[PDB]
Amino acid sequence: LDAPSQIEVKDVTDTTALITWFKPLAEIDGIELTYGIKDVPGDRTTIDLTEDENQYSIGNLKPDTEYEVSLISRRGDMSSNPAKETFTT
Structure with missing residues (x-):
């Protein structure tokens, strides 16, 4: 399986974030x-x-903290390789 593409973290505030x-x-x-x-x-x-x-x-989320997000595509028994990104609040 193909992993999700063009992963972007946007609209980050001290306690929130949007992952697209x-x-x-x-x-x-x-x-x-x-x-x-x-x-x-x-x-x-x-x-x-x-x-x-x-x-x-x-x-x-906790203010002034570095976070990691990981995404995997799934189809039954199968999964893609994980794609990871970091962001800071």
Whole structure:
């Protein structure tokens, strides 16, 4: 599976951020989005999106903190390779 393309984090405030991407080429059941404070290994929330969703708004983040977001395309048993980006509030 092809990973989501043109992933951009925009509209970042001290506590919120908007993640946007382009839908993968291949048909997929959904996208798994995982985000958390970059250097805290245990801080990882995963959201399962449906194939139709192309953006996700995150709130209640910590100010002046570096975060990492990772996205994977899914289709049954299969998953794409993860694509990751960092952003700072």
